C-alpha cells in the first residue's frame, strides 16, 4: 500500500522496523541500510553529551515523511534499525571489541551500516572492521568531514582516543593514503604534530580555507574521485562541526567559519553520483548543546538526503502517476 506517501484519509531510525544484529536476519529483511547506535564516549577528551545522540537522532528522523519529492523517492523499507551496541562502563578495550563485531556482522549481511556515535574514536574500529571485511586483496577509500584532523600519533599517553582517529585509520594496510580525503579542517584544535604527521604520510587534507579558495565544489569533486576511483569499498564519516556554528550548535566542539547547509546538500548529491557507499558514520552530535534540535535536524536531513539521492541515482523512484485518489 502507498497510503503513507500521501496526506492521511518503538524508537527507531526513520520509524523503521527493528531487525536483530544478525547477518542472516539482516540479509533476509529486504532493506539496504542498517542503523546501529553506538552510545560510547570514552574516546572523548572534551565536553560530554554524545552518548545521548543516537536517541535524539532517531527521534528527529521520526518527524519527516518517507517521501522526498525533490528526488521522487520513498525511503520506506530502505532501512532497518538494529538498536544499540551494549557496552560496560569504564571498559574501553572491550567496548571496541564489541563495536568491531557489530560492524563485521552488518557488513557480512551485505547491508550498509549507518553508525551513529558517540564520539569520533568509534570510527577507528568501524573503519578497521571494513578493512578486515574486504581484506588484503581489495582497496578501501575513506572520506571524513570535520574541523579537526585527529592526526595525533598519541594523546595523553593513549593511541585510540578521538584525536588519534585519523592517525590510526591511515595505518590500515589496504587504505592507500591517496584514497583518503579529509575536508573542513580549520581553527586551533589542530596541534602542530597533526600537520607534521599528515605531511610525513602524504595525507592530502582539504582545509576549509583550501575549500573556500577553490569555490568548494571543484576540490570536493577531486577528493570524491580519489576515494571512489579504483576502490572496492568506501567509508564515509561526518563530524558536523564541519558546518558553520550557526548551522550545527549541538555538536561536541562547534567551530565558526564552516560549511552552510546548502553547500552540504550539494556535496551529498555529488557523493551520490558515484552510486554507492559501504559504511556511513556520524559522530559527535551533542544534543544537550542544541537549540530547536538544529544540529540533529541538519544531520538527519544530510543522512536522509544521501539515502534519497543514492536511490535516485539507482533509478529506484516512485511511479510519477500515482495519485492520492487510487
Amino acid at each position: 500500500s502507498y497510503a503513507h506517501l500521501f496526506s492521511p484519509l518503538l524508537i527507531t531510525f526513520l520509524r523503521s522496523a527493528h531487525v536483530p544484529l544478525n547477518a542472516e536476519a539482516l540479509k533476509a529483511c529486504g532493506a539496504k541500510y542498517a542503523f546501529v547506535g553506538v552510545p560510547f564516549d570514552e574516546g572523548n577528551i572534551g565536553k560530554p553529551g554524545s552518548e545521548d545522540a543516537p536517541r535524539e537522532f532517531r527521534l528527529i528522523t521520526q518527524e519527516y515523511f518517507s517521501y522526498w519529492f525533490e528526488y521522487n523517492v520513498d525511503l520506506h523499507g530502505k532501512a532497518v534499525d538494529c538498536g544499540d551496541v551494549s557496552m560496560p562502563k569504564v571498559s574501553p578495550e572491550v567496548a571496541h571489541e564489541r563495536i568491531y563485531r557489530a560492524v563485521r556482522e552488518v557488513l557480512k549481511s551485505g547491508l550498509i551500516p549507518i553508525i551513529c556515535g558517540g564520539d569520533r574514536s568509534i570510527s577507528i574500529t568501524a573503519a578497521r572492521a571494513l578493512s578486515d571485511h574486504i581484506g588484503p586483496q581489495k582497496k578501501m577509500g575513506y572520506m571524513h568531514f570535520g574541523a579537526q584532523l585527529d592526526m595525533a600519533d598519541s594523546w595523553a599517553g593513549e593511541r585510540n582516543l578521538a584525536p588519534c582517529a585519523m592517525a590510526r585509520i591511515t595505518e590500515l594496510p589496504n587504505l592507500d593514503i591517496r584514497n583518503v580525503a579529509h575536508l573542513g579542517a580549520r581553527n586551533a584544535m589542530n596541534p602542530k604534530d597533526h600537520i607534521d604527521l599528515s605531511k610525513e604520510r602524504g595525507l592530502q587534507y582539504d582545509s576549509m580555507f583550501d575549500l573556500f579558495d577553490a569555490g568548494i565544489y571543484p576540490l570536493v569533486e577531486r577528493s570524491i574521485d580519489r576515494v571512489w576511483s579504483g576502490t572496492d569499498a568506501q567509508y564515509l564519516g561526518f563530524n558536523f562541526n564541519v558546518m558553520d556554528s550557526s548551522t550545527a550548535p549541538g555538536v561536541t566542539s562547534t567551530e565558526p567559519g564552516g560549511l552552510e547547509s546548502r553547500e552540504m546538500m550539494r556535496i551529498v548529491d555529488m557523493i551520490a553520483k558515484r552510486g554507492g557507499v559501504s559504511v556511513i558514520d556520524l559522530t559527535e552530535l551533542c544534543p544537550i548543546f542544541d537549540i530547536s534540535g538544529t544540529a540533529a535536524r541538519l544531520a538527519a536531513c544530510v543522512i536522509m538526503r544521501l539515502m534519497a539521492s543514492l536511490a535516485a541515482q539507482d533509478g529506484d523512484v516512485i511511479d510519477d502517476k500515482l495519485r492520492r485518489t487510487d
Binding site: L5, F6, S7, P8, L9, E63, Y64, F65, S66, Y67, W68, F69, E70, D244, S246, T247, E260, S261, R262, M265, I291, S292, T294, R297, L298, C301, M304, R305, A308, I318, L322, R323, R324
Partner: protein
Amino acid sequence: KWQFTPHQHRGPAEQFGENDHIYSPKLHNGSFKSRGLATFMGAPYCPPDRHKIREMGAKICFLAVPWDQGQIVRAGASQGAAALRDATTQYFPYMFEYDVDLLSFFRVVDCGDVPTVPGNNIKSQEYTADYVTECLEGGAKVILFGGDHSLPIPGAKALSRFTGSGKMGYLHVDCHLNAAPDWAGNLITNCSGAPRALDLPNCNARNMAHMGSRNGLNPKDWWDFYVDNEIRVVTMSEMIERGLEVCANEIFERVKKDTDSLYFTWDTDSIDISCMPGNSAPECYGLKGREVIQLARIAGRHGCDILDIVEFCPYFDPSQIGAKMTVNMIYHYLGSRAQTLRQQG
C-alpha cells in the same frame, strides 16, 4: 483621530514634535530599553472597523491573527505577535536604506488582534475573514501576523470577496508545499492554503505560485497539486541555482499579470533554521538572512494587497533573532513599497 506620542511616554516629559519619532529621543529613552505600552511601530491603535480606519486615513493596517488551533504540527504561533510588537521597540519607524518614514508615509495603525474561539476552527476563520474585510473596506492594505498557516484561507477569502469581478493572484513562500486536498477529511487546516485559494472564483492557477520548498515534510499529493493544475513551483534548489532576484521577479510578474489584487503568504519556515529556530516546524536548507531582506525588498517593489507572515513561535527561540527578523520582513516590504510609490510620483 490619527494621533500618536513620539517615543511613547506622556505625562511631564511628553514629546510633541511632529517628526520627533524619526529622530534620536530628546527628553528620555522612549521604549528602547523598557517596552511600556507599545503598539506595532508605536503607531496609533485603530479598531478594525471600516469607519475608524477611513476617518484616520490609514493606508496600512497591522492586524495580528494569533489563531494557532487550525494546524496539524504544534501550537505556539499564538505567542508570536506579542514578541513582534515588542521587537518594534528596538527600531525607529524611519528607514535610512529607503529614506522613508514608514509611519507617516502609510499612516499605519495597529488594529490589535483578531479574536479566537478555542477549539473552533470554522468560527475562528470566519472572525478572521470579517476582521480583514473591515481593514480592506476602510481603504487600507493589510499586514497580517499569524498564527498558524491556516491564515491564508480566511485571508485570501476576504481579499477575493473584496476584489469582486476583478482577478486576484496568490503567492505562497514556504518550506512546505501546503497543498493537501484535505487532511484526514478537513479542507481548512494549515496544510491546504494553496488548494483553498484555487477554489476562489477569481483566483486562477495562472496567477498562483509557490517558492521555497525543500526536504521531506511534503506528501506527494502536495506536489501533484501543482503539476496537475499547472501552477509554478520554484524550489529552494532552483532559487539557489538561478538566483533569488531572477526567480522572485519572474514569480511576481506571474502572479500580478492581469490581476487587480495580490495575496502573499510568507511562512517563517522558508527561512533557514540558522536564522529562525523559533518556528512550529523549522527546516535547514532555507533563505539566509540577507536573502530574507532582499525578498522583502523585491516584494515591496512589486506590491501586494495583503502580506501575511506566519508560524513564528517565540517560545522555541531564546534570543531576539526570530522577533527582529519578522520586524525586518515587514519593515523592508514597507520601505521598498514607499520608495517605489514615491519614484512613480
